Design a protein around this motif. Structure first.
Motif, mmCIF file in Angstrom:
data_model
loop_
_atom_site.group_PDB
_atom_site.id
_atom_site.type_symbol
_atom_site.label_atom_id
_atom_site.label_comp_id
_atom_site.label_asym_id
_atom_site.label_seq_id
_atom_site.Cartn_x
_atom_site.Cartn_y
_atom_site.Cartn_z
ATOM 1 N N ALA D 32 -11.681 48.461 1.267
ATOM 2 C CA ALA D 32 -10.474 48.802 2.027
ATOM 3 C C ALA D 32 -9.624 47.560 2.254
ATOM 4 C CB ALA D 32 -10.738 49.474 3.383
ATOM 5 N N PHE D 33 -10.014 46.406 1.722
ATOM 6 C CA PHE D 33 -9.159 45.234 1.783
ATOM 7 C C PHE D 33 -9.587 44.305 0.666
ATOM 8 C CE2 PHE D 33 -12.405 42.537 3.577
ATOM 9 C CZ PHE D 33 -13.129 43.357 4.414
ATOM 10 N N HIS D 172 -1.665 48.593 19.500
ATOM 11 C CA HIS D 172 -2.440 47.388 19.740
ATOM 12 C C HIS D 172 -3.224 46.972 18.502
ATOM 13 C CE1 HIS D 172 -2.616 48.009 24.410
ATOM 14 N NE2 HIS D 172 -1.387 48.024 23.928
ATOM 15 N N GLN D 173 -3.476 45.670 18.407
ATOM 16 C CA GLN D 173 -4.366 45.096 17.405
ATOM 17 C C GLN D 173 -3.945 45.435 15.982
ATOM 18 O OE1 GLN D 173 -7.080 46.414 20.457
ATOM 19 N NE2 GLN D 173 -8.719 45.659 19.093
ATOM 20 N N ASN D 174 -2.647 45.602 15.742
ATOM 21 C CA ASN D 174 -2.140 45.858 14.400
ATOM 22 C C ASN D 174 -1.678 44.591 13.701
ATOM 23 O OD1 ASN D 174 -0.165 45.730 16.348
ATOM 24 N ND2 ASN D 174 1.306 46.905 15.114
ATOM 25 N N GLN D 177 -3.110 40.280 10.262
ATOM 26 C CA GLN D 177 -3.918 40.990 9.270
ATOM 27 C C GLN D 177 -4.367 39.921 8.283
ATOM 28 O OE1 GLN D 177 -2.697 44.842 8.007
ATOM 29 N NE2 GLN D 177 -1.090 44.913 9.566
ATOM 30 N N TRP D 179 -6.317 39.647 5.852
ATOM 31 C CA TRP D 179 -6.507 39.922 4.435
ATOM 32 C C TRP D 179 -5.269 40.521 3.785
ATOM 33 C CZ3 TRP D 179 -9.898 36.740 3.671
ATOM 34 C CH2 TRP D 179 -11.073 36.653 4.394
ATOM 35 N N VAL D 180 -4.097 40.297 4.357
ATOM 36 C CA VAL D 180 -2.835 40.686 3.740
ATOM 37 C C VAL D 180 -2.012 39.422 3.505
ATOM 38 C CG1 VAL D 180 -0.759 42.044 3.968
ATOM 39 C CG2 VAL D 180 -2.939 42.919 4.848
ATOM 40 N N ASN D 222 -5.101 40.367 16.975
ATOM 41 C CA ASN D 222 -6.379 40.311 16.277
ATOM 42 C C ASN D 222 -6.746 38.859 16.038
ATOM 43 O OD1 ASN D 222 -8.079 42.586 15.058
ATOM 44 N ND2 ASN D 222 -5.990 43.389 15.198
ATOM 45 N N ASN F 31 -1.898 51.961 6.187
ATOM 46 C CA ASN F 31 -2.666 50.871 6.758
ATOM 47 C C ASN F 31 -3.989 51.323 7.355
ATOM 48 O OD1 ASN F 31 -0.770 49.075 5.961
ATOM 49 N ND2 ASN F 31 -0.105 48.462 8.028
ATOM 50 N N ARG F 102 -7.517 49.102 14.615
ATOM 51 C CA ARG F 102 -7.276 47.934 13.773
ATOM 52 C C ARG F 102 -7.104 48.366 12.327
ATOM 53 N NH1 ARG F 102 -12.048 44.107 15.982
ATOM 54 N NH2 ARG F 102 -12.901 46.057 16.850
ATOM 55 N N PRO F 103 -6.073 47.892 11.648
ATOM 56 C CA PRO F 103 -5.799 48.361 10.296
ATOM 57 C C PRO F 103 -6.839 47.846 9.316
ATOM 58 C CG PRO F 103 -3.834 47.474 11.326
ATOM 59 C CD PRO F 103 -4.989 47.051 12.162
ATOM 60 N N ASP F 104 -6.807 48.433 8.117
ATOM 61 C CA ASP F 104 -7.739 48.025 7.075
ATOM 62 C C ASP F 104 -7.579 46.549 6.760
ATOM 63 O OD1 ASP F 104 -8.073 50.748 7.180
ATOM 64 O OD2 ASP F 104 -8.007 51.035 4.995
ATOM 65 N N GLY F 105 -6.339 46.060 6.765
ATOM 66 C CA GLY F 105 -6.054 44.692 6.377
ATOM 67 C C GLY F 105 -6.536 43.629 7.347
#
Lengths: 212, 306, 216, 306, 212, 216
Positions: D32-33, D172-174, D177, D179-180, D222, F31, F102-105
């Motif tokens: 998924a990443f 929240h917590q978006n 990232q 791994w982007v 995060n 996401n 929390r998103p996958d990324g």
């Protein structure tokens, strides 16, 4: 110790022009060279430290550059106040300070003849045991002027005195005062007197003189 | 085990007294100040000294919990250790590891996280190592912030150094003073277990400093920071722990583009470097240059002029 | 509001002794090292001595080692120079200069003195205080002449201070008699060579020898 | 030359993707990443990859000059190199070395010094790696500050990262990232010269991550940051440059208080670590534990269960 | 896969009291265990993630702890709304989810006898081919109650049906409904009927019954 | 304002097929990975399938591999479950649940679903739709009884909704006939056993079989 020579010893520039002073060191002293300005009668004024950083409150018309051995002080647009004497200084023999021989920044003017005057001795003096005569020069430029006296046409390169004024705050020229000091022994036993006044900007040695 | 020094260049290395990169090598005459830092102190056989630790990002940082000081914008921090365990003010160290070793005002950011909901807050803050409220050996220091109502209690708080500040209505460049130690116990005690002061024991020899420029955040501060050893040599000596065959190791500075030796210096077993020079000198080096260990030498070895 | 104010100096007979002093205000005195610098009249600067703020490090120029003693009392914010066994090579203006603006505790050991003293003259002569003597001088110019006088200075004015356009007072000169001499001239049209009076007002404060005199 | 890994513990080491200490070891299931960071990428024989450089304090920092953006509190920075020389946007790298490799908003301080009088100014600032104005490969980025009138032009400016921020009326917590990847050339180009993505080539093997916690400065961010190699191993492999006898080196995690092996793992020549485990696991290790290289192994070596 | 057992399957507690639920895993799953709450007719509600972090908007009366294998959900002061079913969940076999068997949190009350009623069949039904009788129990606690029918004093452990209500929102007791379903073949060929009703909190099996 | 709204489901004959759908609003759909979860009536939760936001990673439970197909269209913010070859083991409520917050990324691969769907019932029976039948029942209690009815639900009221104190409607039960059954009782004093009327109003919307009936 490391030696610091500035060059040249004198600079003549027109107000508004650009001054470039040089300091050169016997061996490398990195960037640790400071420049000072001294107006007469005052203490030195710090202009540049670390070869190229303006001290606090210094106008931006002052710029310093250099490293190692060859250093340069530059005044972009000379103002009437920036005519002073300039010392470079290093401190490689900590803690001692070492200064340069200084560089004098003179005001440059057109050539002006010396309006020469000459004065008899006062005879209120001719009873104190000693007499003295003057050969005045007023409002002239450049400063260089050879003056030679002649007692019955004989140079007296053993006794004389000399004093120069400073550049006028208005006219920007110098003025000179000769001095022939003898006693009454040779004062009245001679009567032929010759003042030699040669100055660039004349026509031929303007000789004003005496006869007791 | 043979002794070695890392083959990193000066730009690749890091200051050991503040989390910033190195910049240049610098030698200067010692005198009128006592070179006695507590960070970047490490012996060649691997023994750390003073407040020295291994991570280059934990220099000048603080961890713990805060408390608002009534009617001010000031906060008092109760110190923790690097791993957030309790701090032991009875350990044989001058102060917690990584604590500053110079008198001045350090600006950074205080950050806090609430373990409950995962909410975060951060504010600019200033710490002055030269006031009465700087008692890290006792476990407590003070911060001046911009808020009087945002930091919570009992929560993990971290101070992150950024630069130095100079406050004043004149008097420029009078702080920081990198060669003046703080009072790690305030006005209520003398500093203890300090790393020894260092000075050349040889006339015409000067120390060689690894110099970086601290960022400035306000006013007219002193942003030059000299350290005795890059943080990378501290890390190297610790891992290798090579026994010293003498009290002085001889290093050579090499330009690998040519293979030529630019200068030689003495790496003292006690953990500092000397060169033979007189006066302040900003060294000019090729960017590829690196130090190289050659031989152990005696007490009376004479160095070639730098 | 940083200030360095000097005291002492004056005249001394060859062989004698003098004491110089610099009083400081406006900064942390123990944080800055202090220098003593001298400038013989008309020449360049010469380093003399250094004493550091806290380390008690003291250094002297080779010309003055054994004769001079530098000292500071950080409690009273003062700086002293003990000068013994002087000679005419030691006639100069003496300055105290501080190492600034960066304190000693910053490690800066480079050349930078941002604040000096005002200057304190030290003269080493065997001569004694004595008053001047004025002799007249005779569009043209006429002036006043001063001789046989010591020490300095000597102020000269014209018509009580109402004739400045043309005054060219020449700086003093020393002689083989130890006493100085001067001259001061003004140019004026011959139209007022007898209409207006011309009185050079000499003043020599060291001996309170005041002299007014008209010229023709 | 024999291969070795440093004998530093996890608390003694540093993250290679943000200037903060490491905290714990962590293994988790990839999927998924895409694990494709550009910092902390370094081969075992000393070749740096992606945006990797050697100093741990130059991660997520920026240098250059600024420019005020009309009617905003925003500033545009024209990028320089680490040594303040000009940046070459035609170098074979994804972006300047040390540039972030994750999408998010980084809060720190902008500091500036005027070369003329030595005056300094510092302001909090925020940079968002996921907007159109984040074009470091082109040499230009944007900062949101608190002042609209203090930063001068043509002067050296430095950005110092402190933490991450999350802005939002919910959600929240978006972000961040980790791994982007950002778009190093904005909307005007695809990323180039990237470090290869890494994943285990063996079922039941997972990556082992070196985990630190980023500070939070605002909101609900995060704060977990995983890296493939501590910055100290990056520095070690570069100096040693030991040739690889195989494509996989076998490491053992040792507790020196007992002498016992806690687990074994594969250090891949490409520069990452795998363990044999299934599911997310926060490893519990003695604080003295360190990695130890044992032997080079083949492609079909089977690991003992972690 | 790793198995998650919760224990016990049921909890009876007084409002205001403290609930302690247990989840235990077959082998270690570190701290990655989440707790969910399910009120009937609704989707699950996330309470605790990462074994001990409250989800967003969750009251502080919910606290989770544990690591490795033994995990514990704790409700400090039980409110009337917190009587639901509770599932623990892990995700060690990514991506799959695995849940526990759930733990039901029942309201604890004093013992209450079942006010037993019984109803004749309707004879509007006695011409559709099938008949059925009821043995009702109303407002009692605890839920357990054995019910056994007897056709001419013969247990029919082959045919019967049973349905229980849920805990009353006011009385906090249950209620029961028996069912004896036969056809008219055995309905009128028998006439002796016995309903067995034994409940803790009675005195002796209160038997209410029938006679066609 | 994050929402997951499901559609589809309903009744299917054993062997047939169904399609489930989840519509998402209030967040970046690509996401987050999505799950399908089912809960048979009265039992616990059971995982069914997963599809990841961007990676196109797809996984199924062992019980449904080969029969189910999961899919998402990130452009239309939708999520679909194709269910073939169903049987009575597949009768359950089916939920779509997202991996959040929390998103996958962010790399988080742990257990956390913060937003579910509303639920969508799927019944696998061969029976056909049919209406209820009400039989009366006879301080004491009397009620109403419902039988032979399918599917669900069945609402029961008393005196058009003006008698709630005492109503104990029992949840349905299935039988060997495939059809459900119910009962609903109320207790009342014998003082109004003939004064006030008592009418249980049955309603079975699946067949529009409404029934009012008085009891005595």
């Amino acid at each position: 110790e490391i030696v610091l020579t500035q060059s040249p010893a004198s600079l003549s520039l027109s107000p508004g022009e650009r001054a470039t002073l040089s300091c050169k060191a016997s061996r490398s002293i990195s960037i640790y060279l400071a420049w000072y300005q001294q107006k007469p009668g005052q203490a030195p004024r710090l202009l540049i430290y670390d070869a190229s950083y303006r001290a606090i409150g210094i106008p931006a018309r002052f710029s310093g550059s250099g490293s190692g051995t060859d250093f340069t002080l530059t005044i972009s647009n000379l103002e009437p106040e920036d005519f002073a004497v300039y010392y470079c200084q290093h401190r490689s023999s900590w803690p001692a300070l070492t200064f340069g021989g200084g560089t004098k920044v003179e005001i440059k003017r057109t050539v002006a003849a010396p309006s020469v005057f000459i004065f008899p001795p006062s005879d209120e003096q001719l009873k104190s045991g000693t007499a003295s005569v003057v050969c005045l020069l007023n409002n002239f430029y450049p400063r260089e002027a050879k003056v030679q006296w002649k007692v019955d046409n004989a140079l007296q390169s053993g006794n004389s005195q000399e004093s120069v004024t400073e550049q006028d705050s208005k006219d920007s020229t110098y003025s000179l005062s000769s001095t022939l000091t003898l006693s009454k022994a040779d004062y009245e036993k001679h009567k032929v007197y010759a003042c030699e006044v040669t100055h660039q900007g004349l026509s031929s040695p303007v000789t004003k003189s005496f006869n007791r | 085990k043979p002794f070695t020094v890392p083959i990193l260049t000066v730009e690749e290395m890091t200051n050991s007294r503040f989390p910033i990169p190195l910049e240049k090598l610098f030698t200067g005459p010692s005198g009128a100040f006592v070179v006695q830092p507590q960070n970047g102190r490490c012996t060649t056989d691997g023994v750390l000294l003073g407040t020295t630790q291994l991570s280059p990002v934990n220099i000048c940082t603080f961890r713990g919990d805060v408390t608002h000081i009534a009617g001010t914008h000031n906060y008092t921090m109760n110190l923790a250790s690097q791993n957030w365990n309790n701090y032991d003010p009875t350990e044989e160290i001058p102060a917690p590891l990584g604590t500053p070793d110079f008198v001045g005002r350090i600006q950074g950011m205080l950050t806090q996280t609430t373990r409950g909901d995962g909410s975060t807050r951060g504010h600019k803050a200033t710490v002055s190592t030269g006031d009465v409220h700087f008692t890290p050996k006792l476990g407590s220091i003070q911060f001046n912030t911009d808020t009087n109502n945002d930091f919570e209690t009992g929560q993990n708080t971290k101070f992150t150094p950024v630069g130095v500040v100079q406050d004043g209505n004149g008097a420029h460049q009078n702080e920081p003073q990198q060669w003046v130690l703080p009072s790690y116990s305030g006005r209520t005690g003398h500093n203890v277990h300090l790393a020894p002061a260092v000075a050349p024991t040889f006339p015409g020899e000067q120390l060689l400093f690894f110099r970086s420029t601290m960022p400035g955040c306000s006013g007219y501060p002193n942003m030059n920071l000299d350290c005795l050893l890059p943080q990378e040599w501290v890390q190297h000596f610790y891992q290798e722990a090579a026994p010293a065959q003498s009290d002085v190791a001889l290093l050579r500075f090499v330009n690998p583009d040519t293979g030529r030796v630019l200068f030689e210096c003495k790496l003292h077993k006690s953990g500092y470097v000397t060169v033979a020079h007189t006066g302040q000198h900003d060294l000019v080096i090729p960017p590829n240059g690196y130090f190289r260990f050659d031989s152990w030498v005696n007490q009376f070895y004479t160095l070639a002029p730098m | 509001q940083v200030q360095l104010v000097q005291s002492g100096g004056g005249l001394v007979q060859p062989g004698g002794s003098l004491r110089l002093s610099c009083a400081a205000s406006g900064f942390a005195f123990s944080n800055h090292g202090m220098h003593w610098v001298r400038q013989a009249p008309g020449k360049g600067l010469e380093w003399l001595s250094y004493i550091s703020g806290s380390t008690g490090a003291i250094h002297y120029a080779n010309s003055v080692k054994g004769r001079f003693t530098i000292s500071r009392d950080n409690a009273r914010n003062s700086l002293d120079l003990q000068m013994n066994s002087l000679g005419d090579e030691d006639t100069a203006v003496y300055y105290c200069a501080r190492d600034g603006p960066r304190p000693d505790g910053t490690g800066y050991a480079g050349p930078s003195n941002d604040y000096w003293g005002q200057g304190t003259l030290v003269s080493v002569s065997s001569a004694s205080t004595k008053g001047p003597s004025v002799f007249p001088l005779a569009t043209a110019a006429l002036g006043c002449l001063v001789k046989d006088y010591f020490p300095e200075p000597v102020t000269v004015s014209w018509n009580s201070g109402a004739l400045t356009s043309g005054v060219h007072t020449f700086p003093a000169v020393l002689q083989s008699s130890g006493l100085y001499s001067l001259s001061s001239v003004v140019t004026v049209p011959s139209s007022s060579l007898g209409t207006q009076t011309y009185i050079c007002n000499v003043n020599h404060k060291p001996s309170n020898t005041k002299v007014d005199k008209k010229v023709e």
